[PDB]
C-alpha cells in the first residue's frame, strides 16, 4: 500500500539564516478566506473613519496677511510655489509659499488693486530674464495698469531694479485683468474691455459688446486666444482674438462673479455667480449648463479648477470654501474657520494638492485639497494601503453606515441654519409646483441646467 503524508520540512517555512524574513505561503481558496464581503466592508468603514480623523486640512496662513483684506490673487502657471496677492489698500505682495514669506511688497496703487496677474513679458527689444525676475502686473480703480518685476531666488546661476518697469494708463477705471499665455498680450476689463500688449502704452483694441461695463476676465489656458468676461448686466461674453471681436454672450438671472476655464478640456468653463451656485458651461453650446454645483448658501465669489481638470474649488460670501467633483454637482468638502471672513479669492495651486484662499480680514491661507492626505513621500506598503482604501471607500460609498460618516462635517451655525431653511423653502416650492402641475394643462418641465439662462444671442438650431 502506497502512503504519503504532509511533509512540511521546516526549511521552506522558517529560514535558516536569522537575518532574512519568513516565507509567507499563500493559498487563494475562498474556503481559506471566508468573509470576503464583510471583511472589506469593515476595511472600508475603518477607512472612512480614519479619513474623518485624519482630516486636518489647514496648512497655514502665509506671512502676516495684508492690512485691508485680500481681493486679488494670482498664481503663476510655471512655478509651483509663487503667488501674488493684492488687498484693498493698494498693496500687492509676492509670496514664496514654501517658506510662507513675501519676496517683496509694493505700495502699488492708491485705490483698491482690483486685478493682478503674472506675465512672461515678451519684449522685442529686451530679453526676459525669467530665471531671476518674475513679473506681475496689476490694475486698479485709479485708472492705472502697472507692471512690476521681482527678484527671485530659485536658481543660483547669476551673481537689481525690482519695481515698476512700466505704467499703462487708461482714461477710466479698470476692474479685472488677465494675461494671455503667449505673445505679450493681456486684457483689462473695467468701464470697457481693452486688449493690451506690454510694448505699446495704449490699448491695441477695444472689444466691447455694448456700452455696459465689464466686471471680470479670464483668458483660456489652451486655445489661448479665447477670452471670457462677466458684465454687470448679468452677462457672460466670449471673445475671440483671431477675429478680434466678441463671439457670443448669454444673459443669466444674477451676476457672474468669476469664470475659470477647464485646463484639460479647453472649451468648458465654470462660472461662479450670485445665486448661490456655480455653472459648468460648454463654449460650443451655451444654451444649457452641463453642471450646476449647488451647495453654497450665499453669493459665490470665486471659482478655480484643479490643474488636473477633475475638481473645482469655490469660495463664497458665506465665510466658507467648498470643493466639488466636476461630475457630481454637490460639494465634496467644505472648509471654514471662525477666523476666516468672506472668502473673496480662491486659487488651486499647480500641484493640484493645495488650495489658496484669500479672505477679507487680510489673510491668505493654505489648505489641503484632500484633507486626510499627507505630503510626505510614501513607501510602497503605505502607498498600496492608501490606494486600496481609496478603492474600497469608492466601492462601498453608498452603504448607509459609511455614507453617513463620509458625508459628515461640522458647518458653522449660520450656514447650518441657512441650509435647513433653504431646505424647507425648496421643499415648499416643490410641493406648490407639484400642486400647480396637477391642475394646469401645459406646464413645461424645465431642466435645472436651463433654469438660470434668461437668454442667449446667436440662437441655436
Amino acid at each position: 500500500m502506497k502512503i504519503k503524508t504532509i511533509k512540511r520540512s521546516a526549511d521552506d517555512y522558517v529560514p535558516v539564516k536569522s537575518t532574512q524574513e519568513s516565507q509567507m505561503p499563500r493559498n487563494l481558496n475562498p474556503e481559506l478566506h471566508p468573509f470576503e464581503r464583510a471583511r472589506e466592508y469593515t476595511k472600508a468603514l475603518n477607512a472612512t473613519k480614519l479619513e474623518r480623523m485624519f482630516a486636518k486640512p489647514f496648512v497655514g496662513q502665509l506671512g502676516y496677511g495684508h492690512r485691508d483684506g485680500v481681493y486679488a490673487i494670482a498664481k503663476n502657471y510655471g512655478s509651483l510655489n509663487k503667488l501674488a496677492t493684492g488687498s484693498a489698500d493698494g498693496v500687492i505682495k509676492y509670496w514664496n509659499m514654501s517658506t510662507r514669506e513675501e519676496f517683496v511688497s509694493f505700495k502699488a496703487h492708491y485705490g483698491l488693486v482690483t486685478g493682478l496677474c503674472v506675465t512672461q513679458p515678451r519684449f522685442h527689444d529686451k530679453k526676459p530674464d525669467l530665471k531671476s525676475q518674475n513679473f506681475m502686473l496689476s490694475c486698479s480703480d485709479d485708472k492705472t495698469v502697472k507692471l512690476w518685476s521681482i527678484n527671485v531666488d530659485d536658481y543660483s546661476n547669476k551673481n537689481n531694479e525690482e519695481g515698476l518697469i512700466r505704467t499703462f494708463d487708461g482714461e477710466s477705471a479698470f476692474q479685472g485683468i488677465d494675461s494671455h499665455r503667449e505673445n505679450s498680450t493681456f486684457a483689462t476689463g473695467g468701464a470697457k474691455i481693452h486688449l493690451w500688449d506690454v510694448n505699446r502704452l495704449k490699448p491695441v483694441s477695444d472689444l466691447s459688446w455694448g456700452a455696459d461695463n465689464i466686471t471680470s476676465l479670464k483668458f483660456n489656458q489652451n486655445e489661448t486666444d479665447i477670452l471670457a468676461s462677466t458684465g454687470s448686466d448679468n452677462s457672460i461674453v466670449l471673445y475671440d482674438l483671431r477675429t478680434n471681436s466678441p463671439t457670443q454672450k448669454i444673459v443669466q438671472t444674477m451676476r457672474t462673479n468669476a469664470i475659470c476655464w477647464n485646463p484639460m478640456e479647453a472649451f468648458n468653463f465654470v462660472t461662479a455667480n450670485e445665486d448661490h451656485n456655480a455653472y459648468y458651461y460648454d463654449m460650443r453650446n451655451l444654451s444649457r449648463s452641463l453642471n450646476v454645483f449647488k451647495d453654497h448658501v450665499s453669493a459665490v465669489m470665486d471659482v478655480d479648477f484643479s490643474p488636473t481638470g477633475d475638481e473645482i474649488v469655490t469660495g463664497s460670501y458665506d465665510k466658507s470654501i467648498r470643493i466639488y467633483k466636476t461630475n457630481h454637482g454637490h460639494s465634496r468638502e467644505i472648509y471654514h474657520t471662525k477666523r476666516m471672513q468672506h472668502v473673496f479669492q480662491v486659487k488651486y495651486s499647480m500641484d493640484s494638492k493645495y488650495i489658496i484662499s484669500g479672505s477679507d480680514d487680510g489673510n491668505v491661507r493654505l489648505w489641503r485639497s484632500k484633507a486626510w492626505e499627507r505630503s510626505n513621500v510614501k513607501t510602497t506598503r503605505e502607498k498600496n494601503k492608501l490606494e486600496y482604501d481609496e478603492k474600497l471607500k469608492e466601492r462601498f460609498r453608498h452603504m448607509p453606515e459609511i455614507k453617513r460618516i463620509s458625508r459628515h462635517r461640522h458647518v458653522p451655525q449660520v450656514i447650518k441654519k441657512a441650509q435647513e431653511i433653504k431646505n424647507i423653502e425648496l421643499s415648499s416650492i416643490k410641493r406648490r409646483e407639484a400642486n400647480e402641475r396637477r391642475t394646469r394643462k401645459d406646464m413645461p418641465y424645465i431642466s435645472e441646467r436651463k433654469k438660470q439662462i434668461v437668454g442667449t444671442v446667436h440662437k441655436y438650431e
Binding site: D12, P15, K17, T19, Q20, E21, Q23, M24, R26
Partner: protein
C-alpha cells in the same frame, strides 16, 4: 510582497511550457518551489550576490534542460512560443536586479556583460550600450572597464569614432594610469595599420599617419609627469631643493621607464613606417627634460637612448645586409660617444660588441663581422 509579484510573473511561461507538451505539472511545481526559494532569498533582507549567481545558474540549467527536452519530445529546436525567450529574459532581469542592488562587484558586472554579449542575435547592442553606460558611470576610475568597452566596440563592431570617444573620455577621467595611455596608442596604431592595409588591399585588387600616436605620446609624457609630481610630494611642497631635485629626477626615471616600455612594445607594429614611428619617439626623448638627463645624472638612460639610436636601423635578423650597409654609422656612433664619455665609453663599446655578436661560410661573413667589431 514582491516575491509574490515575481513568482506570478513566472506563470505564463509555464502555462505555455505545459501546453507545449514537454514539462508536466508535477515537475513544473518542483521548478517553481526552487524558484520560490530563490526569489525569496533575492528580495528579502540579508541578500547576497551569491544568491543572485546561484539563481542565474539554476535558471540557465533549467533552460538547458528545456532545450534538451524540446529536442527530444517535439523534435524542434525552438517552439517559437513564449517559453524559449522568457527564461533568458528572466536571467537578464536577475542580472539587472543584482547590479542595481550590489553595484560593486565587477565579477558580477562582467558576468552580466558576458551573458548579454553571448546571447547573440537576440540581444541588442544598444542594450549592451546601456549597461556599459551605467557601469562606466559608477566606476569611472576603474580602467579595465574603459578598455573592455572600447575593445567590444572596436574588435567586434569596428566603430572607430565611438572607440576614440571612449578612450578620450577615459583619459579625461583617470589621466594617471599608464595602462590606458598604452592601450590608446595601441588602438591608434591598430586603426592606422588597418587603414594602410585596406589601402594596400585596394591597390592589390584594383597624410593620415602615426603622428596621432606621437601626439598622444607627447601628452602621455606631459600629463604622466604632471600627475606623478602631484601624486608624490602629496600634501604640500614643504621640501628643500635637495628633495625637489630628487623628486624631479625620480619622475624623469618613472616617465622614461614607461617610454622604454613604449618602444619595447612599439617595435612589433611593423606594417607602417616603423622606422619613422620609432625615430619620432627617439627625437621626443632626445630633448631636454629640465633636469639634465644628458649633462648630469640619468647618464645611463642617455647611454640607453644612444644605444637605441645606434641599433635603430640595426634592428635586423642574422642576414646582416643592413649591417654591411651602415655599420659605419654604428662605428661613428661609438666614436662620437667615446669622444666624450669616460666609463660609458667602454660600456657602450663592450655593449655594442656583445649585442652585435649575440644578434649576428655564414660564420666567415660573421668572421668579417667579428673582425669589424673586434
Amino acid at each position: 510582497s514582491k516575491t509574490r509579484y515575481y513568482l506570478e510573473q513566472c506563470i505564463p511561461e509555464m502555462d505555455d511550457l505545459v501546453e507545449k507538451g514537454l514539462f508536466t505539472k508535477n515537475e513544473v511545481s518542483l521548478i517553481m518551489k526552487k524558484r520560490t526559494d530563490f526569489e525569496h532569498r533575492l528580495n528579502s533582507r540579508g541578500s547576497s550576490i551569491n544568491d543572485y549567481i546561484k539563481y542565474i545558474n539554476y535558471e540557465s540549467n533549467v533552460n538547458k534542460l528545456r532545450a534538451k527536452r524540446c529536442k527530444r519530445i517535439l523534435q524542434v529546436k525552438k517552439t517559437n512560443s513564449l517559453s524559449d525567450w522568457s527564461i533568458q529574459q528572466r536571467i537578464g532581469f536577475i542580472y539587472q536586479r543584482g547590479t542595481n542592488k550590489f553595484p560593486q562587484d565587477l565579477k558580477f558586472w562582467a558576468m552580466y556583460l558576458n551573458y548579454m554579449k553571448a546571447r547573440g542575435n537576440q540581444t541588442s547592442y544598444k542594450k549592451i550600450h546601456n549597461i556599459y553606460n551605467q557601469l562606466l558611470k559608477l566606476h569611472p576610475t576603474n580602467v579595465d572597464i574603459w578598455i573592455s568597452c572600447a575593445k567590444y566596440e572596436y574588435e567586434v563592431h569596428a566603430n572607430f569614432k565611438s572607440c576614440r570617444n571612449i578612450f578620450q573620455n577615459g583619459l579625461r577621467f583617470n589621466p594617471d594610469v599608464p595602462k590606458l595611455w598604452y592601450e590608446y596608442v595601441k588602438f591608434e596604431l591598430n586603426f592606422i595599420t588597418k587603414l594602410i592595409n585596406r589601402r594596400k588591399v585596394m591597390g592589390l585588387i584594383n597624410a593620415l599617419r602615426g603622428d596621432i600616436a606621437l601626439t598622444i605620446f607627447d601628452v602621455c609624457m606631459k600629463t604622466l609627469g604632471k600627475h606623478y609630481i602631484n601624486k608624490h610630494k602629496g600634501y604640500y611642497a614643504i621640501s628643500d631643493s635637495k628633495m625637489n631635485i630628487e623628486l624631479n629626477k625620480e619622475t624623469l626615471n618613472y616617465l622614461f621607464s614607461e617610454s622604454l616600455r613604449y618602444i619595447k612594445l612599439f617595435d612589433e607594429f611593423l606594417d607602417l613606417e616603423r622606422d619613422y614611428l620609432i625615430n619620432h619617439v627617439l627625437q621626443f626623448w632626445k630633448n631636454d627634460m629640465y633636469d639634465l638627463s644628458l649633462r648630469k645624472d640619468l647618464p645611463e638612460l642617455y647611454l640607453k637612448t644612444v644605444m637605441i639610436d645606434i641599433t635603430l636601423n640595426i634592428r635586423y635578423m642574422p642576414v646582416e645586409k643592413l649591417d654591411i650597409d651602415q655599420l659605419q654609422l654604428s662605428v661613428k656612433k661609438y666614436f662620437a660617444y667615446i669622444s666624450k664619455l669616460d666609463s660609458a665609453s667602454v660600456k657602450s663599446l663592450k655593449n655594442e660588441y656583445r649585442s652585435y655578436l649575440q644578434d649576428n661560410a655564414e660564420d666567415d661573413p660573421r668572421y668579417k663581422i667579428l673582425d669589424l667589431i673586434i
